[PDB]
Amino acid sequence: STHFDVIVVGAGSMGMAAGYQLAKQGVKTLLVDAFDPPHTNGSHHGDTKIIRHAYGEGREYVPLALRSQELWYELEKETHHKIFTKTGVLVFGPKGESAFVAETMEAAKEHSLTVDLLEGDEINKRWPGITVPENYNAIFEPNSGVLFSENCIRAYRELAEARGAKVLTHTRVEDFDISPDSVKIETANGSYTADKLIVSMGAWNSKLLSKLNLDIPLQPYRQVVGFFESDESKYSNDIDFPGFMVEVPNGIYYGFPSFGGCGLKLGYHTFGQKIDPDTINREFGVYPEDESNLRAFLEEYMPGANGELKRGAVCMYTKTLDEHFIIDLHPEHSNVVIAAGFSGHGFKFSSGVGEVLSQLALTGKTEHDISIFSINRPALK
Ligand SMILES: *Cc1cc2c(cc1C)nc1c(=O)[nH]c(=O)nc-1n2C[C@H](O)[C@H](O)[C@H](O)COP(=O)(O)OP(=O)(O)OC[C@H]1O[C@@H](n2cnc3c(N)ncnc32)[C@H](O)[C@@H]1O
Ligand SMILES: [Cl-]
DSSP: OOOEEEEEEOOSHHHHHHHHHHHHTTOOEEEEOSSOSSOSSSSSOSSOEEEOSOOTTOTTHHHHHHHHHHHHHHHHHHOSSOOEEOOOEEEEEETTSOHHHHHHHHHHHHHTOOOEEEETHHHHHHSTTOOOOTTEEEEEETTOEEEOHHHHHHHHHHHHHHTTOEEEOSOOEEEEEEETTEEEEEETTEEEEEEEEEEOOGGGHHHHGGGGTOOOOOEEEEEEEEEEOOOHHHHBGGGTOOEEEEEETTEEEEEEOBSTTOOEEEEEOSOOEEOOTTTOOOSTTSSHHHHHHHHHHHHHHOGGGOSOEEEEEEEEEEEOSSSOOEEEEOSSOTTEEEEEOOTTOOGGGHHHHHHHHHHHHHHSOOSSOOGGGOTTOGGGO
16 A cells, blocks of 8 residues: 555666665655566676767767766765776777777767777787787777676665665566556556656566557567686786777677686677577577687687686677667656667666656656657657
8 A cells, every 4th residue: 555656667777776866866666676686687697787988879878878977986986885997998890891980989089088099909019818900990998997787786776775765576567557647567466556657677678568558679689698717917907908899700799807817708799599588598508609609709809818618697688670778758658767678788878877767757857868769769660
């Protein structure tokens, strides 16, 4: 019989940040998650996530990234959990053969961000361990880095509960019942109501937004990462090896320096198996590609980090058709906020999105420019 101000469905990356923002302002909040956040069934585990600022995917992403960065620095000062390490982030690819690299360089020029430009052997000289062809060029952002995602979520969750937020774990929301002046969620453990609703179920948005009369294409992808025994004298954060996102002949890869001897972590971005969140196989290696794709890159570009596989993890991307996020009010219900399809690049923005989501649920508007994320745009189809 407890009526909330706001109910958040899915307390993951976006959800929990949104809950922290709401609780911090005294808004009576209930956060309902299918599991017990942070956990390893969604897309926030794997320990680390890259945060970059020269976002060539859209000028609106830059301010969002820059504001999110400031929010991560604030979070770092408020909790005892480790939030961010300034490893810096390196981007490289074939000179003149990478829209990604070129768009990154343009974004940095356009937004006056601080970056170092280098190419060929300069890359290989600056960062021992990296071996690229002399025809490769790179842009290095020294002030961006790595976020410890599980710590971020755990910190947001602890800060929000200390301010009165309620978290209902291991409870799957099955249906929604929206009325012009209140929202209701349906779960096996009971029904709950509030004045506002935030929906951020990650991969599961591809299966439950239909319950909100929304028919938006969202395709979940199985995306693995691998930790490899590496030459600590080259790939250790301690010796300044950077976080990275690069473009090679067969696609985009991303990785992290070895932290405390955990080994270099790498992930293949351009490819992932299409799956259903409820049946995805979360065992690293069940497929031969899981590991072969990562070693194909390592043996060629960072041969010193191609050692024994120390650890594997399986996580999910949820793509929209244009691969841009969806952050907006529900087209038929102004008391419902949607956050979905972060298509593999949304964690860095989660602190900012948390702010956008709390602004939208409380006022129906946000001070951030989120036009390219409209739920009514045509590219969504
Ligand atoms: C998978 C992946 C993603 C990724 C990455 C590497 C890999 C292997 N590297 C990134 C990087 O370097 N930088 C970056 O900015 N992003 C990177 N990503 C993407 C990022 O992790 C994702 O975009 C982000 O985590 C998406 O967050 P979202 O909040 O959408 O998803 P979630 O964290 O999975 O949380 C969803 C929660 O909702 C709950 N749930 C699901 N269904 C229900 C129902 N029915 N009822 C209630 N709760 C539900 C989940 O349990 C989950 O907690
Ligand atoms: Cl995603």
